[PDB]
Amino acid sequence: TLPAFGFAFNASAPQFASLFTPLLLPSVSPNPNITVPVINDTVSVGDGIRILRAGIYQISYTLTISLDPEAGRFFLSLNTPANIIPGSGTAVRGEVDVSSGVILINLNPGDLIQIVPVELIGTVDIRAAALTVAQISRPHHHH
Amino acid sequence: TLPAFGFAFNASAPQFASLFTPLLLPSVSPNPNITVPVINDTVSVGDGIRILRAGIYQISYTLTISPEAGRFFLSLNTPANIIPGSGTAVRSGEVDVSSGVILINLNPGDLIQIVPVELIGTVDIRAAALTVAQISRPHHH
Amino acid sequence: TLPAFGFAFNASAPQFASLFTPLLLPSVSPNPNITVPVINDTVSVGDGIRILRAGIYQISYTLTISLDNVPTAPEAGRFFLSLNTPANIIPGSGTAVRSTGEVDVSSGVILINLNPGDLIQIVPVELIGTVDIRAAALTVAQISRPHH
Amino acid sequence: QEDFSSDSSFS
Ligand SMILES: [Ca+2]
The Cα–Cα gap between A61 and A4 comes to 17
Q: What SS3 class is residue D4? A: coil
Spatial distance between the Cα atoms of C17 and B92, rounded to a whole number of angstroms: 25
Check: CB of residue B54 under 8 Å from CB of residue B76: no
Find residues 59-78 of chain A whose CB sits inside 8 Å of chain B. Answer: 60-62, 64
Burial classification of residue C132, based on how many CB atoms lie within 10 Å of its CB (0-12 exposed, 13-18 middle, 19 or more buried): middle
A21 occurs within a structural domain: yes
Resolution (A): 1.1
Q: How far apart are CA C31 and CA C38, in angstroms?
A: 9
Range of B60's domain?
5-136
3-class DSSP state of D5? coil
CA distances from A125 to A15, A72, B118, C106 (A): 6, 10, 20, 22
Q: Is B7 in Cβ contact with C113 (below 8 Å)?
A: no
Minimum Cα–Cα distance from A130: chain B residue: B85
User: What is Dmax (Cα atoms) for chain C?
Assistant: 56
Per the CB < 8 A criterion, the answer to whether B101 and A102 are in contact is yes
Q: Number of structural domains, chain A?
A: 1
Residue A15 lies in a domain: yes
Chains that touch A (3 or more CB pairs under 8 A): B, C, D
Q: Is residue B121 part of a domain?
A: yes
Which of helix, strand or coil describes residue D1? coil
Q: Is B88 on the interface with A (CB under 8 A)?
A: yes
Q: Of A47, A109, A120, which is closest to residue A77 (Cα–Cα)?
A: A47
Q: For residues C69-90, b (16+ Cβ closer than 10 Å) or e, as one string?
A: eeeeeebebbbbbbbbebebbb
In sequence order, the β-bridge partners of residue C95 are C79
DSSP state string for chain A: -PPPEEEEEESS--EE--TT-PPP--B----SSS----EESEEE-SSSEEE-S-EEEEEEEEEEEE----EEEEEEEESSTTSBPTT--EEE--EEEEE--PEEEEE-TT-EEEEEEEEEES--EEEEEEEEEEEEES-----
How was it solved? X-ray
Burial of A139 (0-12, 13-18, 19+ CB in 10 A): middle
Q: Which of C41, C57, C34 is nearest to C4 (CA)?
A: C41
For chain C, the straight-line distance linking the first and the last C-alpha, in angstroms and rounded, comes to: 20
Q: How far apart are CA A116 and CA A17, in angstroms?
A: 8
Nearest-10 Cα torsion for A107, B84, B101, B30:
170
* A119 labelled ligand-binding: no
- Return the amino acid letter for C97: V
The answer to whether A80 faces chain C, any CB pair under 8 Å, is: no
Cβ neighbourhood burial of C21 (10 Å; 0-12, 13-18, 19+): middle
HEC secondary structure over chain B: CCCCEEEEEECCCCEECCCCCCCCCCECCCCCCCCCCCEECEEECCCCEEECCCEEEEEEEEEEECCCEEEEEEEECCCCCECCCCCEEEECCCEEEECCCEEEEECCCCEEEEEEEEEECCCEEEEEEEEEEEEECCCCC
In a domain, A27, yes or no: yes
Q: What is the CATH number of the domain that holds A45?
A: 2.60.120.40
Residue A142 falls within a domain, yes or no? no
- Quick one: three-class SS letters along chain C? CCCCEEEEEECCCCEECCCCCCCCCCECCCCCCCCCCCEECEEECCCCEEECCCEEEEEEEEEEEECCCECCECCEEEEEEEECCCCCECCCCCEEEECCCCEEEECCCEEEEECCCCEEEEEEEEEECCCEEEEEEEEEEEEECCCC
The answer to the question of residue B141 being in a domain is no
